[PDB]
Write a protein that binds this ligand. Sequence first.
Ligand SMILES: *[C@@H](C)[C@H]1/C(=C/c2[nH]c(/C=C3N=C(/C=C4\NC(=O)C(C=C)=C4C)C(C)=C\3CCC(=O)O)c(CCC(=O)O)c2C)NC(=O)[C@@H]1C
Ligand SMILES: *[C@H](C)[C@H]1/C(=C/c2[nH]c(/C=C3N=C(/C=C4\NC(=O)C(C=C)=C4C)C(C)=C\3CCC(=O)O)c(CCC(=O)O)c2C)NC(=O)[C@@H]1C
Lengths: 859, 864
Amino acid sequence: TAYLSRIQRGGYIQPFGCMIAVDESSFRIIGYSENAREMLGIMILAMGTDVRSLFTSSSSILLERAFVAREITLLNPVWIHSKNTGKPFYAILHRIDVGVVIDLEPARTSIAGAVQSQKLAVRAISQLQALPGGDIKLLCDTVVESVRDLTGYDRVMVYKFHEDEHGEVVAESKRDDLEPYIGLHYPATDIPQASRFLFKQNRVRMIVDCNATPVLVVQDDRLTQSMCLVGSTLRAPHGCHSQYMANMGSIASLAMAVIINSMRLWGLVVCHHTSSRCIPFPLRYACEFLMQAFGLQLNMELQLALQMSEKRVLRTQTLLCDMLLRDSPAGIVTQSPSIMDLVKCDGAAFLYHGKYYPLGVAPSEVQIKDVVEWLLANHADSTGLSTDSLGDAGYPGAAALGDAVCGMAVAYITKRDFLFWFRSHTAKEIKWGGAKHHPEDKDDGQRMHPRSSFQAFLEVVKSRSQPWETAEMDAIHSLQLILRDSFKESMDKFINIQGDYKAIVHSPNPLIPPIFAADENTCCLEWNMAMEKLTGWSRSEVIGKMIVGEVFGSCCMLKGPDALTKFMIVLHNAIGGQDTDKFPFPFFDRNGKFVQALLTANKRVSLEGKVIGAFCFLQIPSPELQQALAVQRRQDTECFTKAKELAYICQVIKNPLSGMRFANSLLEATDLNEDQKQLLETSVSCEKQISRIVGDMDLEFVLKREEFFLGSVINAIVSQAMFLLRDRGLQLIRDIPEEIKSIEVFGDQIRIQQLLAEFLLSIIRYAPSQEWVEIHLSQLSKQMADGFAAIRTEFRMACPGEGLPPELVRDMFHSSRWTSPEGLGLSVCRKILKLMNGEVQYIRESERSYFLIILELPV
Amino acid sequence: TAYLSRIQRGGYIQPFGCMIAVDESSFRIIGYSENAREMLGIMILAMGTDVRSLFTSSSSILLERAFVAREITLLNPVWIHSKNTGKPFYAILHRIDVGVVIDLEPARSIAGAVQSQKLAVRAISQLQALPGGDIKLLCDTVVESVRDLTGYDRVMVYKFHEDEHGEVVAESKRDDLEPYIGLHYPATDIPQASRFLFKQNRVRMIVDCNATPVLVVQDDRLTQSMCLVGSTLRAPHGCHSQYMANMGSIASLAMAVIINGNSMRLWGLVVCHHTSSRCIPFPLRYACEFLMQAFGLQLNMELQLALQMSEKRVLRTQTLLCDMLLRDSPAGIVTQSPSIMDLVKCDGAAFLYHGKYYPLGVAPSEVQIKDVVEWLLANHADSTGLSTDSLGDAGYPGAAALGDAVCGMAVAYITKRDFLFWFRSHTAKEIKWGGAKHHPEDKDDGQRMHPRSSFQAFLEVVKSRSQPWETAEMDAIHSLQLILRDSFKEDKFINIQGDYKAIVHSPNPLIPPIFAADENTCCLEWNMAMEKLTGWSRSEVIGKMIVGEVFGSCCMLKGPDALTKFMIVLHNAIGGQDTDKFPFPFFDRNGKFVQALLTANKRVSLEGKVIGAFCFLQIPSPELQQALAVQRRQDTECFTKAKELAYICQVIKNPLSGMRFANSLLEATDLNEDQKQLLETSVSCEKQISRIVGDMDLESIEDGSFVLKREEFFLGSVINAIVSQAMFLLRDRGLQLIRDIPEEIKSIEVFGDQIRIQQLLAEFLLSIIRYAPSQEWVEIHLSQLSKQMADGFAAIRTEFRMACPGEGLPPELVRDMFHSSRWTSPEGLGLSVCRKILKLMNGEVQYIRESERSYFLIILELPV
Ligand SMILES: *[C@@H](C)[C@H]1/C(=C/c2[nH]c(/C=C3N=C(/C=C4\NC(=O)C(C=C)=C4C)C(C)=C\3CCC(=O)O)c(CCC(=O)O)c2C)NC(=O)[C@@H]1C
Ligand SMILES: *[C@H](C)[C@H]1/C(=C/c2[nH]c(/C=C3N=C(/C=C4\NC(=O)C(C=C)=C4C)C(C)=C\3CCC(=O)O)c(CCC(=O)O)c2C)NC(=O)[C@@H]1C
């Protein structure tokens, strides 16, 4: 490991402090520094000098008290008064390989221990803890503000390492006469892995002056090996880091590690001062405690993000069970939870003995035959390819395919049948600082000097998409596995290609849950390989047996006070036509091993023969998601103040919705007035919004994208606010580019007119009475490829007036915080755009109004 | 035990079915009944005979496959035909230690456990969508469920109490009979033998008490009788038969309510009484067994909720105990918001310290308290604390002079004649027994053969008598006296109950593990309970900072982030911010992991605003700390549920304005008036939705009554709205509709809330279509009839009738509809609210079964 020998064993310190290596046994010096002779005033000092008699008697007994401790971190910093000049000195004790070593820093102007120093921190920590969760950026901004108002540095920032080991400055609280560093990515080789393990062990590290001379320590002659000083607050930085800071335009740096707990180094809070800044060790230990609280909240939010990822994998497992209950593989594309909802993507294709099935932005049949022919010639062995960019993969015609179909994930099914997923190009620009990260860059300890340039240069990725993770390829391989199993009714290599690195072959585990299926008598119809492996019982021995009593009562032991009844109530509900999701299922292995599974029993409903049955899977989440699902299953029984009225609305409203859509379905017959026919179409698109809104509900998802005229949305949204402008007199102004016959834009008509309802109505809400209002939309049918087009649409819903209040836009732009009904609705309809390829800004001018950009795709 | 041999080995069956006890190896008849030859119609059944010659060859393989199976219970009941006459049977077969007894009940389908349980499933899901915290609603639901299933005349929940006597906690019966609800019964009515029978055969059916017990025959060489503990066909004990005759119970069906945890304890019985001889088929008895299993599940959930609510109150008394431990004066106990009366629930409290009587609530005068103190010095001097339920049974004269108020007493003795008193006023506990009154000395006599002739509801009042002091409340008192005893410096407890011996004990105290941190986080005060918990002694950890070394270095805290969490929360305790029940999992100096609940609050010296931080630990059972986790995450779940409701109301309101604008702009031209009727049906649905998400919060006495729109309407709108609201589910299920409605084109001036009428009408009619069978008709009958209240105030009476030809809507769902504030499904919930709207709107609804199930509802509105 490059620089590990140099940094740790390099005996050079900074001139602001004095380090004194003394063995605890008899206060005998085994090391010292050159500036100690000046800053102490000692002008007797040698190897063997009793330093207990070099200070006040109070600080003598304090130092020998701080020697004999379990942990010495609590003691730091002991207040030590010197004797040869009388000036008090902070004394940062820490134990090293053979002895301890003090670190004397002069004090300008009483902190006797860690707790007194932490008392400064606790106010900022209390401000940091009382923060809404689910937004790392707000937490980082709170940390940089707290560290700025504590330390008094010019520019503090949160450097965050990525998965590539390269970092990015994700927060800033700079002094405003400087330049912003937010967004600037730095290479991995900029900070060596030796320095990051150094920060894992040391966790706070200041310098005072980079242009200061490195004061060398005097190593003991008897021991050849140099001192392995890691936890010293005084040791000078490497000649490379010192020159680097001289080139950076910041001569004082306080960097402290953001550990996330086994001991992942998430990032670094790096402070920068333009002048030479010192800071007392009580304030430095306060900021180390502030970094402890930062790591605390950050781990509390990364665990929540990983639990949301596990919930998303559980949804993917339910989707694969949906795909298992389909009569043909052609049904997958035809039906509504299709192959483009399995994976976050933009198109999806299925080739099934010809008659190619495209969804969204997918190549035509000739183009996909070119893709298939490239997949047969190259990557012949590997069943799955997950290329970030087709151009990097080597497929000819990638330029002809365009940026729209740049990313492609394929899965091979038998008999030359292929499953495809397609992704459009992501317009991400990385403002690299000095040097772009090179994935071939290893740690080069023979490099003397760092680059002098730090002008950030934007690097734009030309024709590549979002990366394909292991989870999405896991889902793709699982669905490919079930489709090949269906093929047998009537080994797998996967190549991952990304722009930064090169083609790697990885075998992905399937994501199929353990599945059994029973008929009305609870006799086994199905018991798949996953369930066979989990329980240990083979399918053949348990097929035909009674699931409710035999197989799970004796054969595969259940667990609980009375669990079998809980099982027998559940499966009889499945046969009876009631489905339970994520019912807890603690059962034992054949070999006596506990499994804390989550049973889901769905009715095996079919056509008018074999009407009802049971299909069940056994999702096994981590025990923190067992807890996270128990804390919401122990909470629907308590919110009976409003869950009764929610189920009351969600059941009673269904009947006049069916009457509305049956009157409107029978009213489509013979209405030859095309103005009235379009008006009825507006009513059908209005009734549908209520049925989609009530039926889908809100739980923040799935988008039922279909072909629709875009002018059929404005006409379906001018009629919602038209009562609110007919009574408040807002004579509206429209100027459209006639997006009637702007056909086939791919998306939700319903969720788009719901977000435009909650934005337009909020705009017309806060207008002056008997006025006007402007709506306007500028479309540009930008061609993206040979045959692929996209229509980018702004929405200028412009109103002159007082406008929405300043707090309600932060209500809208929250993550989980709300105080108003209208604000809640605004927040949800903003998150609807955050789920669907667009965003929304609120601008404040002489007219207070909403910009709204949605990118939709004419097939 | 008493009667166990007589019941288990009493070779007597009931005559409603025959019984053959075959072998387990080669199908020989080890035993049989006298009425086997008459039931099978044989008029060969003898010693050691092959049993499969009696039944049909096709039925024979069912018996053999039942024998091969490891669990005989699942196959039961195997439908078995007869070879000599062609008669069906239910051959319920169970395994005994010396063979396999097969019980033949003549059938008049179901061949297994699953088919039987399918009947129970609807009632089981009825009592599982029920709100927790109560037991009366649960036991009042299960009796209607069993009355719907069994059909017995009177079904009641006979809950056992702690001294083995039982009372009818909930009873459902037809309105002809005597109400048994509240009636306590002596513990000798149900012997320990019967309880141990119910713990291994949980459904017992007596077809006829009067009917003679048919004798068994046995070919077994060994001298023992057949085993009939598990057999459904076992004759009741003669005493129990006489008992049933003397109660008016001709037939009975007693079902065990076994609750168990991880220890099966029989909670109570669901005895079903019939005023005539009745037998229900074994599908229904096995269904009722499964329903009793679900009932035991719901009772287990209610008992665990009660246990953790008691333990939450235990932690609340510990919090109040430390609140009364940090006081400068001993007299602060009497006068503060968390008073001594708050510690242990009581009518009054009294603290005697160096005389100077400190009364609270209802308390006896100083002379009276001095006299009772003199009595407590004269008797029970040796024991410190006394908690007499009644002072009259304690032995104290002048209890009548004290009156009802000072009857119940709880005493804590502190040194140098210092006392703590809690007083409870006389609670009028009047428990009407049935027949005899239970005494705790009454044992189950093994040779008694005749029950009591009487079962009349005679009262039994109590004396000057209070609510019983519990173990936990006396424990709270015990901890309070110990902490006050230590506070002054800075064991036998007698409990007297009016029905029991004066029990002498000493309970485990509730002083929580306490450490007190100063401003520099150094443990000033260290409790003996911390020394019991972590093992660290006080005089070794003294003078050491807690956050870093006493906790982190000495005790192994959680590795990822417990040390940072503890340091932040203790420095916030020193910063004035008190925190309650922080999750604090840690290890000890022995090494055993111990999760806890750190509560850290600021300590005040009364001259310094926040000098020091006080702390105390509570250690719960893991269900309680998980319930505190769900108490914390209620702030995320319940507000997101309310957020879902408010979001739904607003975002639904927007296209309702779009809907009414589209349907008030569609009024240009509708050429055929059928198109205008479809349009007006859509307008009615839109107004219906705008009223469903209007200003109502689902109470019907504050919102549905205060907001009730009153406008004129025309009834063809309502009828075509109902048909349009129903046609999608009609065409989904392939049904017919036969709307036998007269002409109401001319009744334009009927004046009532039409939108609520079409809401309730569609809810009723779509429940009918939801439970109408596949591919048949549904009838909509109306009969508009005149009704007169005045010459100009004339009303109307329309009777909506909805009929379907089949099994129809299940009885559980109508029970949910008429229960009022109880619902199982959201469909039954909407039916319940649409029933309450008809109750509010001068009408009434019925569900009538006349071999084709029909829905009947009337309503009254006045034309103008
Ligand atoms: C006479 C010897 C004593 C006696 C004996 C006895 N009792 C049983 C079984 C039961 N007794 C029950 C009592 C009740 N029945 C009710 O309806 C109510 C209240 C509403 C009560 C309190 C019940 C119940 C049973 C369970 C059996 C059943 O079918 O219900 C037995 C065992 C009989 C058997 O073979 O199963 C015996 C020996 N009971 C008496 O009261 C006198 C003191
Ligand atoms: C030498 C050829 C290479 C080198 C060596 C090097 N760097 C460190 C430690 C740090 N480097 C940091 C880089 C940044 N400083 C910033 O302000 C930003 C972004 C805004 C970045 C990316 C940081 C931070 C550290 C930690 C602070 C610290 O003092 O450690 C070290 C370890 C030195 C030590 O102190 O022991 C070394 C050997 N860096 C280079 O860029 C060249 C290629």
